From Swiss-Prot:
Native source organism of the sequence: Saccharomyces cerevisiae (strain ATCC 204508 / S288c)
GO biological process, one term: apoptotic process
This protein's record includes keyword Oxidoreductase: yes
Residues binding FMN, per UniProt: T37, Q114, R243, R348
Pfam families, A to Z: Oxidored_FMN (PF00724)
Function noted in UniProt: Flavin-dependent enoate reductase that catalyzes the chemo- and stereoslective hydrogenation of electron-poor alkenes. The enzyme is reduced by NADPH, and oxygen, quinones, and alpha,beta-unsaturated aldehydes and ketones can act as electron acceptors to complete catalytic turnover. The physiological oxidant remains elusive. Has a prooxidant activity, increasing reactive oxygen species (ROS) levels when overexpressed. Formation of OYE2-OYE3 heterodimers contribute to the induction of programmed cell death upon oxidative stress.
Catalytic activity field: A + NADPH + H(+) = AH2 + NADP(+)
Keywords: Flavoprotein, FMN, NADP, Oxidoreductase
Gene3D superfamilies: Aldolase class I
Gene behind the chain: OYE3
Disulfide bonds: none
Family under the similarity heading: Belongs to the NADH:flavin oxidoreductase/NADH oxidase family.
Subunit structure: Homodimer or heterodimer with OYE2.
Protein name (Swiss-Prot/TrEMBL): NADPH dehydrogenase 3
Active site (catalytic residues): Y196
Length: 396
């Protein structure tokens, strides 16, 4: 059914429907599908779904010139721990990714692989099954006492990364980035947000290290910036974006309650702009908004009111993607896209609206999303959300 209380506004007349160059790609409009974990990949081997994923992505690529960022994709076994999320380290994984990318390119849209590493958000017992470590910035902090218990129950306690461990993650990012590009992706997005491994190094709650990877703003930023630099130099800066969530509390991050958190992110962005000034500008920065501090909460819940991402615009001068409860607030988008380098990521309503871009252009009602099929091994709730016309052919 359609979202009941929703009054659509047509955005055809705004910068949301003006083209923009992002890296090597040429977008027709600035409505971006952000990374969305859907757990349709098959076990063993974290293989993308061969029946439905190319259909799902192709449906949502239908408007030519759409930028699509894939679900989080593991760079290596050690970086994972979720059996039904995809990887891109292996030949069999890349075999299906080529077909997904072909489905998006057949629609004249673009595909960016979000490269993922889980750190303390992983499952210690699944990792142990596979002979893998339970990795974190500092083993003196756990997400919660439950994951602490399961960690001890699996005899796989948190492992503070060594310097050699970090170097191996950097190699795995390079490997996964190279596989992404050889498979046909137009670029990659380094996931450094939402409390996963790289965010765990940025945040002073998770990162209590005393080597060169913690203890200061500069040290906490080092792992993320080394991944950035490694990929700049192997696939080029125009094929690399970075995702950050300054105000997020998901996965036990500090958010705005830490008064030092804007300095931490301001340092990362300043370092990105320095690289751009020396001729190596990343394709984009992708920010999660304080509008959504936790994506497991319904729209309007978990909204942080005492901070904004405006600081980013004074530091980073390249494209910025913003994401968080924009689908139901066209009045906010209308304002924010007056800035000529701003794109809007639409998460949960891209799940439910394959023709979301058309609906935003024409101001049409939106399909409700069904939270119970966000993560089921099913085409139901994946590829069977109707387009607007189909929805009217159904009574909605
Ligand atoms: C089911 C679901 C899966 C998501 N998966 C990812 C992911 O793999 N990587 C990521 O960076 N963000 C992920 N997110 C966060 C979204 O990209 C987005 O930032 C957030 O949902 C807020 O945007 P929205 O209100 O438009 O949905 C996910 C969110 C949801 C709801
Ligand atoms: O499954 C939800 C999810 C949220 C944020 C992410 O970064 C990844 C997955
Ligand atoms: Na390879």
């Amino acid at each position: 059914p359609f979202v009941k209380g929703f009054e659509p506004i047509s955005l055809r007349d705004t910068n949301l429907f003006e083209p923009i160059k992002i890296g090597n790609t040429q977008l027709a409009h600035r409505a971006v599908m952000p990374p969305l974990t859907r757990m349709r990949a098959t076990h063993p081997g974290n293989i993308p779904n061969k029946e439905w994923a190319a259909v799902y992505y192709g449906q949502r690529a239908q408007r030519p010139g759409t930028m699509i960022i894939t679900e989080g994709t593991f760079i290596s076994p050690q970086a994972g721990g979720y059996d039904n999320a995809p990887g891109i380290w292996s030949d069999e994984q890349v075999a299906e990714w080529k077909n997904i990318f072909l489905a998006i390119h057949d629609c004249q849209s673009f595909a960016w692989v979000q490269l993922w590493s889980l750190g303390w958000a992983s499952f210690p017992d699944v990792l142990a099954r596979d002979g893998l470590r339970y990795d974190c910035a500092s083993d003196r902090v756990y997400m919660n006492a439950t994951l602490q218990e399961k960690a001890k129950d699996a005899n796989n306690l948190e492992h503070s990364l060594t310097k050699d461990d970090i170097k191996q993650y950097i190699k795995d990012y390079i490997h996964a980035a190279k596989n992404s590009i050889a498979a046909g992706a137009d670029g990659v997005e380094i996931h450094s947000a939402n409390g996963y491994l790289l965010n765990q190094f940025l945040d002073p709650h998770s990162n209590k290290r005393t080597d060169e990877y913690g203890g200061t703003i500069e040290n906490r930023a080092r792992f993320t910036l080394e991944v950035v630099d490694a990929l700049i130099e192997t696939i080029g800066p125009e094929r690399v974006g970075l995702r950050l969530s300054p105000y997020g509390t998901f996965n036990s991050m500090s958010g705005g309650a830490e008064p030092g958190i804007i300095a931490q992110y301001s340092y990362v962005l300043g370092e990105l702009e320095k690289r751009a000034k020396a001729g190596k500008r990343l394709a984009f920065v992708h920010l999660v908004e304080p509008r959504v501090t936790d994506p497991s909460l319904v729209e309007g819940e978990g909204e942080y009111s005492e901070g904004t991402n405006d600081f980013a615009y004074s530091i980073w001068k390249g494209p910025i993607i913003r994401a968080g409860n924009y689908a139901l607030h066209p009045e906010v988008v209308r304002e924010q896209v007056k800035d000529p380098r701003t794109l809007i990521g639409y998460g949960r309503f891209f799940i439910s609206n394959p023709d979301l871009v058309y609906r935003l252009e024409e101001g049409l009602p939106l399909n409700k999303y069904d939270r119970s099929t966000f993560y089921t091994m099913s085409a139901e709730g994946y590829t069977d959300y109707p387009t607007y016309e189909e929805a009217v052919d159904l009574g909605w």
